[PDB]
Design a protein around this ligand. Sequence first.
Ligand SMILES: *[C@@H]1O[C@H](CO)[C@@H](O[C@@H]2O[C@H](CO)[C@@H](O)[C@H](O)[C@H]2NC(C)=O)[C@H](O)[C@H]1NC(C)=O
Ligand SMILES: *[C@@H]1O[C@H](CO)[C@@H](O[C@@H]2O[C@H](CO)[C@@H](O)[C@H](O)[C@H]2NC(C)=O)[C@H](O)[C@H]1NC(C)=O
Ligand code: NAG
Length: 49
Amino acid sequence: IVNNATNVVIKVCEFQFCNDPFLGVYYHKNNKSWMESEFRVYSSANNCT
Ligand SMILES: *[C@@H]1O[C@H](CO)[C@@H](O[C@@H]2O[C@H](CO)[C@@H](O)[C@H](O)[C@H]2NC(C)=O)[C@H](O)[C@H]1NC(C)=O
Ligand SMILES: *[C@@H]1O[C@H](CO)[C@@H](O[C@@H]2O[C@H](CO)[C@@H](O)[C@H](O)[C@H]2NC(C)=O)[C@H](O)[C@H]1NC(C)=O
Ligand SMILES: *[C@@H]1O[C@H](CO)[C@@H](O)[C@H](O)[C@H]1NC(C)=O
């Protein structure tokens, strides 16, 4: 279950998970905006219904 700042996603797949999975939000100084930029959770996704 991940909330990637735009839509709630529920997936049950054979993920090859990273040892340090995370999400990365980048703050842009010039326009003072925060954007979702990094999605480091799974290296692969297969075999799921
Ligand atoms: C959050 O995750 C969802 C699902 O993984 C993303 O929605 C998909 O985005 C891709 C990229 O354009 C589309 O091809 C798919 O059709 C989308 N699925 C839908 C609409 O059901 C969503 O883009 C992700 N959000 C961010 C900011 O990365
Ligand atoms: C995961 O995906 C693999 C890749 O297709 C599947 O491996 C084969 O699946 C077929 C379909 O039943 C079997 O006949 C083969 O014996 C499987 N192994 C090989 C080496 O071909 C695997 O079944 C999938 N697992 C799940 C739970 O969906
Ligand atoms: C802020 O600037 C960056 C880079 O110029 C851009 O990617 C981002 O979309 C901008 N944010 C807004 C809210 O316009």
